[PDB]
Amino acid sequence: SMNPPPPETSNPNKPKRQTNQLQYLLRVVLKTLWKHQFAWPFQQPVDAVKLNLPDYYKIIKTPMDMGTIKKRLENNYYWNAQECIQDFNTMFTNCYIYNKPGDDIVLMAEALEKLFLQKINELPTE
Numbered sequence: 001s002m003n004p005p006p007p008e009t010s011n012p013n014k015p016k017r018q019t020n021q022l023q024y025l026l027r028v029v030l031k032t033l034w035k036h037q038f039a040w041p042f043q044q045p046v047d048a049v050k051l052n053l054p055d056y057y058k059i060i061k062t063p064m065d066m067g068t069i070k071k072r073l074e075n076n077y078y079w080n081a082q083e084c085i086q087d088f089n090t091m092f093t094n095c096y097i098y099n100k101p102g103d104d105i106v107l108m109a110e111a112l113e114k115l116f117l118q119k120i121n122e123l124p125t126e
């Protein structure tokens with residue numbers, strides 16, 4: 001059993017831009033979600049070997065997690081805030097598609113997503 005390589009977090013050819021919106025996504029959004037009691041399943045790429053989920057990467061073809069987002073924000077990977085917001089939305093959607101309603105992991109993702117959406121609604125103006 002094998003995990004895929006993680007999503008890209010370093011690419012010297014990709015143009016980068018530090019924006020006040022991206023700064024908010026790191027210092028407010030990511031740091032708040034990271035400390036949440038339900039953050040732990042989402043703090044690193046899904047380890048389908050360790051978690052005995054051998055079909056995970058057969059079903060989920062755009063994996064994303066907050067460990068990768070944290071690296072992308074701290075290492076200035078992005079050009080705009082929308083790219084980072086899409087990463088969070090992908091992470092949540094993966095969990096909803098792979099698991100079933102009623103699963104504890106889905107209740108955890110739903111709690112984090114409610115927090116995320118509240119914070120995104122207060123994304124500062126550029």
Ligand SMILES: O=C(Nc1ccc(C(F)(F)F)cc1)Nc1ccc(S(=O)(=O)N2CCC[C@H]2CN2CCOCC2)cc1
Pocket residue numbers: 093096097100101102103106107110
């Ligand atoms: O599936 C999704 N989204 C989603 C799916 C597919 C796609 C796709 F990619 F296809 F487009 C995109 C997004 N979300 C979600 C589903 C069930 C629960 S639930 O089972 O936990 N449950 C039942 C109803 C609400 C909840 C009860 N909550 C208890 C605590 O108080 C608040 C409500 C939680 C979240």
